[PDB]
Amino acid sequence: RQLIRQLLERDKTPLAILFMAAVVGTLVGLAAVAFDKGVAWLQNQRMGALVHTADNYPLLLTVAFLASAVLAMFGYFLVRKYAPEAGGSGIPEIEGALEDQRPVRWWRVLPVKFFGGLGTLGGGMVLGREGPTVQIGGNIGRMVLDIFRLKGDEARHTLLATGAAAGLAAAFNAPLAGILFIIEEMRPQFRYTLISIKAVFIGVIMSTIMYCIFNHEVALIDVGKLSDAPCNTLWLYLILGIIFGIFGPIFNKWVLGMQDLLHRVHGGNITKWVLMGGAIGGLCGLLGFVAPATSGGGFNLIPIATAGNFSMGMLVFIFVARVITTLLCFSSGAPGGIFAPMLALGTVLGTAFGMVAVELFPQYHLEAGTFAIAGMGALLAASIRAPLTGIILVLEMTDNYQLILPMIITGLGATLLAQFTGGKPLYSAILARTLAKQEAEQL
């Protein structure tokens, strides 16, 4: 009573950050659930109010095109106006914010990364919510430093990585992917002052506690308990990392090559960025009815492809027609991450390797889905090149933790073959292309 509580005056500012890291993690966990439950409302009101008479296929294709384009145009007009920095994932806009390179305007991003991400991702576009939640989370961590008035220089990098950790923890119910997002992915940007790593923990805890009360689901991806991977067959997860580790730098040259190729029909205009974003967001709404595996930001193709429900000629067709629809969305300037459309390209090429590995090897008794869970985090290690948070996020979402060894081998063969090929991390190459564009345009 009177022998313990007098030590608060000794370290009053560390206990001022760790209390504020509890209100960062609470406010990010509310803004992430209202994102995910608010984007599922616009996705259920779209397909639910699509079929009306069930025999009017000319009008039903028109409604599926316009009602997903106007929602997408609401997410493209609110981005190039009033908040131009919320025009992509948001992981490069916080990686250049832990180091003092990019400004953090929470008064502009938070009514835009929320209300534009609800119209972009709610239009059936191939874009995930790992983008608009870590960017929202990185700005709520900046928001409480202007509400609670503190001008600390170490309390502004601590809370901005707290809500960024709380954004990944409250988007995928993944408390371990949120902490290791700051540790090993954002390694040259984090400080680790022994109180900042405790403040990341409170923000991750309070954002996953607020995921309990409104999301009573067991997993985000509903693939059950798959088979084990014996260590007679752990060399096929090294050939899987070789195949994924070569496509990774080729995909990063395709992301950054389509950001400049699509930036030629409009050239930077406002009346032509929006009309192009409605032609993209309407095409991914028109694809939501005629081919539901092509459109969408993953997470429904993922527990279907890993069960062997697709054929071989249809898994090749999806990988061609999902690369086209994920380079037309993320490499266009829409608020939405490339993360969840990379989880849907990992279970397609992973199963296409897993369906061939049971024809050449009948003596291994291989399941065709164990290469889809392992391949899911193998494009996150070759493109983004954050292999450890990309294999404690496939495990946190599919709950298939028995593949903890084969998912490292395909996460290590992907990182090793992406560095040998000549590939950069994707979230550090979008940031390095926006800083060099900022320096060369104002001069």
81: left (phi over 0), alpha (psi -120 to 50) or beta: beta
Binding mask 176-195 for a second copy (x = CB under 8 A): x--xx--xx--x----x-xx
Residue 175 Cβ vs Cl ion, minimum distance, rounded to whole Å: 18
Q: Report the residue number, 341 or 413, with the smaller CB distance to Cl ion.
A: 341
Using the rule CB under 8 A, give the single segment among 54-62, 90-98, 260-268, 399-407 that binds a second copy. Answer: 399-407
Q: Report the residue number, 416 or 432, with the smaller CB distance to Cl ion.
A: 432
* Contact flag: residue 22 with a second copy (CB under 8 A): no
Q: Report the residue number, 121 or 379, with the smaller CB distance to Cl ion.
A: 121
* Contact flag: residue 380 with a second copy (CB under 8 A): no
The most distant pair of C-alpha atoms in the chain lies apart, rounded to whole Å, by 77
Among 36, 93, 95, 396, binds a second copy (CB under 8 A): 396
Binding residues: 89, 338-339, 427
Give the closest residue to 107 by CA, choosing from 134, 145, 70. Answer: 145
Q: Rounded to the nearest 5°, which phi and psi values hold at 306?
A: -80, -10
**415, interface contact from a second copy, Cl ion, none, CB < 5-8 Å by kind:** a second copy
Residue 101: C-alpha distances to residues 94, 96, 248, 432, 435 (Å): 9, 5, 27, 11, 8
* Residue 210 amino acid letter: M
* Residue 318 in tokens: 């999806």
Residue 87 Cβ vs Cl ion, minimum distance, rounded to whole Å: 6
C-beta of residue 85 within 8 angstroms of C-beta of residue 107: no
Q: Which string of b and e fits 386-409 if b means at least 16 CB within 10 Å?
A: bbbbbbbbbbbbbbbeebeebbbb
Binding residues for chloride: 89, 338-339, 427
Q: Report the residue number, 72 or 200, with the smaller CB distance to a second copy.
A: 200
Q: What residue spans of 364-405 are helical by DSSP H?
A: 370-376, 379-382, 394-398
C-beta of residue 393 within 8 angstroms of C-beta of residue 130: no
Residue 292 Cβ vs a second copy, minimum distance, rounded to whole Å: 31
* Contact flag: residue 16 with a second copy (CB under 8 A): no
How many whole angstroms separate alpha carbon 243 and alpha carbon 319? Answer: 14
**266, interface contact from a second copy, Cl ion, none, CB < 5-8 Å by kind:** none
Q: Report the residue number, 49 or 212, with the smaller CB distance to a second copy.
A: 212
- The H or E element that residue 16 is part of is helix 14-48
Using the rule CB under 8 A, give the single segment among 74-82, 100-108, 255-263, 415-423 that binds a second copy. Answer: 415-423
Report the alpha-carbon angle 61-65-66, nearest 5.
120
Residue 270 Cβ vs a second copy, minimum distance, rounded to whole Å: 40
* Contact flag: residue 3 with a second copy (CB under 8 A): no
Give the closest residue to 282 by CA, choosing from 74, 441, 137, 106. Answer: 74
Q: Report the residue number, 187 or 437, with the smaller CB distance to a second copy.
A: 187
* Contact flag: residue 226 with a second copy (CB under 8 A): no
Among 114, 181, 201, 310, binds a second copy (CB under 8 A): 201
Give the closest residue to 238 by CA, choosing from 10, 363, 406. Answer: 406
Residues that bind Cl ion (CB under 5 A): 88-89, 121, 128-129, 297, 340, 430
Q: Report the residue number, 78 or 177, with the smaller CB distance to a second copy.
A: 177
Using the rule CB under 8 A, give the single segment among 46-54, 273-281, 354-362, 412-420 that binds a second copy. Answer: 412-420
Residue 182 Cβ vs a second copy, minimum distance, rounded to whole Å: 11
How many whole angstroms separate alpha carbon 303 and alpha carbon 326? Answer: 19
DSSP 3-state helix, strand, coil percentages of the chain (rounded to 5)? 65, 0, 35
* Contact positions vs a second copy (CB under 8 A): 7, 11, 18, 175-176, 179-180, 183-184, 187, 192, 194-195, 198, 201-202, 204-205, 208-209, 212-213, 230-231, 234, 387-388, 391-392, 395-396, 399, 401-402, 404-405, 408-409, 411-412, 415-416, 419-420
